Design a protein around this nucleic acid. Structure first.
Ligand SMILES: COc1c(N2C[C@@H]3CCCN[C@@H]3C2)c(F)cc2c(=O)c(C(=O)O)cn(C3CC3)c12
Ligand SMILES: COc1c(N2C[C@@H]3CCCN[C@@H]3C2)c(F)cc2c(=O)c(C(=O)O)cn(C3CC3)c12
Ligand SMILES: [Mg+2]
Ligand SMILES: [Mg+2]
Ligand SMILES: [Mg+2]
Ligand SMILES: [Mg+2]
Lengths: 245, 487, 487, 247
DNA sequence: TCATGAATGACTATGCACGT
DNA sequence: TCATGAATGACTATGCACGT
């Protein structure tokens, strides 16, 4: 068991449960999203740490400079574990670390930066499956009479729309289908019912198979060597769609 | 270089500041209960079409439209004003339908302008109802490019309903919010008893407006402060939250706070109690835990010691925290460009007067337009009776000016009417199409007579205010939230 | 809960980011030389009517319109992008007419959004010329509510004219600005010699485009780097400011810097000289004084010691300060959704290709519309030829449909034409108006003939681009600013 | 007497002049960062310095002295003027013999003026008595004639006058662009500020005079003091007649 | 001494590539 | 290490009146 604040980051909205095993940390993109998330969370088991701005690239940046970065300090301090050789999973204050960023490309970029931080400073958190990725909704179908539905893809939107219309439900062609361009546009309720309610949230657990293969990929994508990254993109971007086929 | 004495400069400049702040920034117009920024935001959204019949527009567009046309000030503070009007814990009857993160009753700030969308609420649509029918005076904006409303039609008593708080120079206002249904009853009585003097009117209205109705619910303790506010224009109203004592399986007891009085910051309240225990001043309290959520609402659990009495700790909370706090009522509003402290009957009466003015002006506008339509229709009817000649006349004319001048002479018609004949489509020459012109004339003349009758009868005017308000209250009226108890 | 491998997640996410930054953000489209935010701001202002034929709109309105309809990002950075397009020291040919404080070449920041107004410049109006005539492909915006353009018509070669600098992922662009008159000559040659191969075209275009023309004037030293940039797509261009030695009355000599190379902050430049003396690295310098003003422009006076040679101090300034600095040209632009490094002949050609596409598409649209108008006019003339019969028919109809169906029967008409006859006003039955309809048909058939001729002849199409562009250059073209000297 | 100007122990916001002679030097105290930025650009850097003030100035009549001295904007003013305050006031150390207060023509600019004049009258009164304090009158309108040079107006009346004269003279204005209305200094660029408030050959300055010190003291205490009641009654008493102070 | 709310925005840190 | 330029906003201080 570990004490919750009521010596930790000022931005941290800690949970109430003293048990790390039951506790969860939602690392959120933006003050707005983190603010509403703080309101829609389950304050018992879920803590919120909003991260502001692009995270510093630990692959590129010198070590001391990373340690000066306020956002990195917030993460390291909040997780309780150390870093590198001084890492101790026994001090892990949340056994569930959910990264929640916008569905857009900048959210994807922030994810890669956070995953780089974790893989380089606190790898065991990934190896032991304590790192997760929340999948935000993209659309909200607001039926005239029926309860609203959330869609996490264009396909799902098309499907739910088809099913509803076939079932006799109807939507306004003005209000209609609300499209989310980021977590910041969501209120507390919407976040709870899509990304934080454990009974409906869509989490993806980050797994680490080949550490050496992961190591070189991180070094390529996040490293200082531009040439290597440039050729990698031109080589593999052509086939990004077909990774899961 | 011209010389100027410091006394002249100081006096002139400060008075100019004081006056515009009083009449133009910080204090609400008695008729619609709005400050200039509120009025300008709402009309900007209205004119932009940001209405509940369409999807929420990005709130940046509302701010930008307000800035560029009506409010020559900063975008930031304007957004704050727009946000406040969307918060259900701020306004008893929100005027802005906000989409996104608009903050909380605690220290959680609203999201930035970029993240939020906004549109007018249905009730705000009643604030602006028929504003385009010359129901209120318009004046040029800050650079004369466009017109802005001096006051909104305000088809429900918004000043009393939503209240107002404002710091000016030399004075300040603090009007509490009220229940719409209770205000409506007061207005209904004021309309029926249109000849009743202030003494009787105050007695009647005070009987119907039982007291303020805060959006944060809670409790009103006592009746004197409420009475003072309505009879004097100033009074101290004691507010309380609600506390519900819970027992534990162990037998331990805890106080559950689910409501707080108006304008009490939830996080400051918890922090206050926390600071008022960490160093004593609230013994008997064992633990403070905020079990609040978006689903259960406010829920502050105060576990107390075994050797502690529930009511003793509750009474201590009433004493040393804002769990019990008073609303410093000060009924100050701008009346005809002058700041005035008002009795409740005066607040009701001045609003009823505004409604009557709106309805008469609307009727006047509609009557004028009805005549213009009738005037042109009469012109068309004349053309149809001599249609064979009219067409032959137009065809044989070398120009349209010649045709117009001829039409005037042919049918003994105005130039406006003759212009309408010329603008007439060949569509309108079909048998059934000729008939509708006749019928439309018959239709309008009935409408004209009706409008004339309304203007001639104050009874109907008052009846319209009553019926139209009743419709609004039936649709948008809600239950009382703040409970009123005795000492 | 679904499992995902870290390599899969990393690769997909970062590539998706890199590709959007490359193609959607940081790098200019070769056809109009615009990044997405630029294009969206400009079209937002354009559609909003913020054009030179009206007073400056508050810049907040441009930001809000861009943000709300096209650019799903923050108001701040969007304002920055709009501001930069209004700065004469940033853009060789400003696209935004700014009113108010938009900053300086030094560290003086632009005024906040609230303080400034903005509208499109005349040249920016050439960027958007006839965009509403289906000259460019439109796509749905970020929420599908409205349509936005994929590219602007760009009736002057804006990529080369204004240049572009952008940091993407895995690559970056740095195209310098050029003199519009010189670009036009290259375009004219490309049009005349439309079949010339790349070698000849590169030789011809390099002869006419003498080198970059920076808004900050200054000097270009040497020719190698310019040639490399045009031949390779990569080149290092040495820039210099302008120094003028002055001899004082008392006897001392001073260096007067009146120009600096492109993208050199004046305040940083002064601070750099100062600080390299504070430590002591530019001996011979006695005193540094910034005599700059809004009226004389840049004027930095560097008084040198009596035992110091002016040329030596200037060479020391060239070496140790940005008085001499290189422009790292990297001619990278998006071509057909693909990032590509381009020779100068390729940049010209691709632009000419885009212009021909615009003109052909415009002609097609005008021909379609012209045919429609003629189609209806053909109907109108038939009505006029049998005017007596037309009216009698419409009269006897119970509806307008019976009248319509009859008109088809009478004159062998479409439904469109008959409907157009129906919508006709009696105004047009006057003599001159009837004749106006006749002449209008004759006019359109003449215009249709002209339009058909254009589509059938590439020669005319190239002629149109040449002549229209020539008109733009004569009106909006200016003198060269950056002087080109040898080693 | 001469004093060093800052060039790469004075306020960071201060854009000092080059001339080391206070008798020839001027300090423009400007309302807002934007206006201060434009002033810094349009000024004559030889004799004119710019000290932008951000936000409403602290009321030295209401606030206690220790809190006033901790206010960053007051510190900037006191430091920039070089003189001390109250008993430690030494006019010999005055760094500028012209202190131009330049605020928006609008209502909040007037308010800031009274707050600044309150600071000066209470902390540095001799600056007022010796005529070192001035008030800049910003333009309200800019008439943009189609072919002629543009004209500035400092009142509605002057706008009407210049409009009539120009039209009578055969000049013409666009009814779209036309007459630009300034709502504050921040809306002006460097040039516009120079040609209306900073060019000493065109600027309209008002020199603050102090006749009756005892009467001034009373007025200052009433308008700016802690007593609300006195201020309220004064406003309701005298606001009715503000138009007729100069008739 | 703290809250209210309508007025009077610059500063702060990162990603990203490239050349000093 | 700094500049470039589109991307990812909270904090900071006064006026003004009034009540605990
Ligand atoms: C720079 O002034 C402001 C400050 N500062 C003023 C002080 C003196 C200088 C050093 N900083 C402090 C804080 C502040 F804290 C907040 C705001 C503010 O919110 C605001 C708005 O439009 O909403 C507008 N302004 C500006 C119009 C003046 C604010
Ligand atoms: C809080 O993020 C920002 C910072 N901070 C991020 C850092 C970490 C925390 C402590 N502050 C530093 C500075 C900053 F300095 C500037 C901007 C900024 O200009 C901006 C914009 O729209 O233009 C948007 N944002 C936000 C959308 C992220 C900025
Ligand atoms: Mg986003
Ligand atoms: Mg603010
Ligand atoms: Mg920014
Ligand atoms: Mg102002």
């Amino acid at each position: 068991a570990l004490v919750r604040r009521k010596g930790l980051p000022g931005k941290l909205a800690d949970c109430r449960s003293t048990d790390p095993r039951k506790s969860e940390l939602y690392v959120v993109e933006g003050d707005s999203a983190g603010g509403s998330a703080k309101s829609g969370r389950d304050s018992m088991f879920q803590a919120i740490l909003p991260l502001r701005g692009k995270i510093i690239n630990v692959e590129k940046a010198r070590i001391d400079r990373v340690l000066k970065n306020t956002e990195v300090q917030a993460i390291i301090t909040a997780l309780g574990t150390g870093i590198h050789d001084e890492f101790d999973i026994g001090k892990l204050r949340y056994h569930k670390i959910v990264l929640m960023a916008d569905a857009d490309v900048d959210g994807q970029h922030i994810s890669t930066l956070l995953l780089t931080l974790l893989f380089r400073f606190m790898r065991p958190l990934i190896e032991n499956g304590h790192v997760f990725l929340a999948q935000p909704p993209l659309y909200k179908l607001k039926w005239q009479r029926s309860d609203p539905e959330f869609a996490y893809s264009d396909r799902e939107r098309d499907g739910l729309l088809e099913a509803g219309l076939k079932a006799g439900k109807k939507i306004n062609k003005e209000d209609g289908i609300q499209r989310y361009k980021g977590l910041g546009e969501m209120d507390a309720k919407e976040l709870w019912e899509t990304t934080m309610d454990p009974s409906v949230r869509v989490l993806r657990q980050v797994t680490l198979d080949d550490a050496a293969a992961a190591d070189e990929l991180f070094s390529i994508l996040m490293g200082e060597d531009v040439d290597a990254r440039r050729s990698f993109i031109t080589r593999n971007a052509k086939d990004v769609r077909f990774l899961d086929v | 270089i011209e010389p100027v004495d410091i006394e002249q400069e100081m006096q002139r400049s400060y008075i100019d500041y004081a006056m515009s702040v009083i009449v133009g920034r910080a204090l609400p117009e008695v008729r619609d209960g709005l400050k200039p920024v509120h009025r300008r935001v709402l009309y900007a959204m209205f004119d932009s079409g940001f209405r509940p019949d369409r999807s929420h527009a990005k709130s940046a567009r509302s701010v930008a439209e307000t800035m560029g046309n009506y409010h020559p000030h900063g975008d930031a503070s304007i957004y704050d004003s727009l946000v406040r009007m969307a918060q259900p814990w701020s306004l008893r009857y929100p005027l802005v339908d906000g989409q996104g993160n608009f903050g909380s009753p605690g220290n959680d700030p609203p999201a930035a302008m970029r993240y939020t969308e906004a549109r007018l609420t249905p009730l705000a649509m009643e604030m602006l109802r028929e504003i385009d029918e010359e129901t209120v005076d318009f004046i040029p904006n800050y650079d004369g490019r466009v017109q802005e409303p001096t006051v909104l039609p305000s088809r429900f008593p918004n000043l009393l309903a939503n209240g107002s708080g404002g710091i000016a120079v030399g004075m300040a206002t603090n009007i509490p919010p009220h229940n719409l249904r209770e205000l409506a009853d007061a207005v209904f009585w004021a309309l029926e008893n249109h000849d009743a003097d202030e003494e009787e009117t105050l007695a009647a209205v005070m009987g119907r407006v039982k007291g303020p109705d805060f959006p944060t619910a809670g409790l009103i303790v006592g009746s004197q402060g409420t009475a003072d506010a309505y009879k004097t224009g100033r009074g101290s109203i004691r507010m309380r939250g609600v506390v519900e004592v819970e027992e534990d399986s162990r037998g331990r007891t805890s106080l559950v706070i689910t409501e707080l009085p108006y304008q009490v910051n939830h996080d400051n309240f918890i922090t206050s109690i926390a600071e008022q225990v960490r160093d004593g001043k609230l013994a008997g309290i064992s633990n403070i835990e905020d079990q609040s959520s978006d689903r259960v609402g406010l829920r502050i659990v105060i576990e107390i010691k075994r050797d502690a009495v529930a009511k003793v700790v509750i009474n201590n909370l009433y004493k040393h925290t804002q769990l019990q706090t008073s609303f410093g009522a000060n009924m100050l509003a701008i009346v005809d460009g002058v700041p005035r402290t008002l009795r409740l009957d005066q607040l009701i009466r001045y609003y009823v007067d505004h409604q009557l003015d709106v309805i008469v002006r609307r009727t006047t506008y509609r009557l004028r337009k009805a005549n213009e339509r009738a005037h042109i229709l009469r012109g068309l009817v004349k053309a149809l009776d001599a249609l064979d000649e009219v067409i032959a006349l137009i065809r044989a004319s070398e120009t349209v000016d010649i045709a117009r001048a001829g039409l005037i002479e042919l049918l003994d018609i105005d130039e406006i009417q003759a212009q309408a004949i010329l603008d007439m489509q060949l569509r309108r020459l079909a048998a059934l199409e000729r008939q509708r012109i006749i019928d439309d004339l018959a239709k309008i003349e009935a409408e004209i007579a009706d409008l004339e009758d309304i203007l001639a009868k104050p009874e109907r005017q008052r009846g319209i205010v009553r019926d139209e308000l009743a419709e609004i209250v039936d649709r948008h009226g809600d239950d009382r939230r703040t409970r009123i108890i005795a000492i």
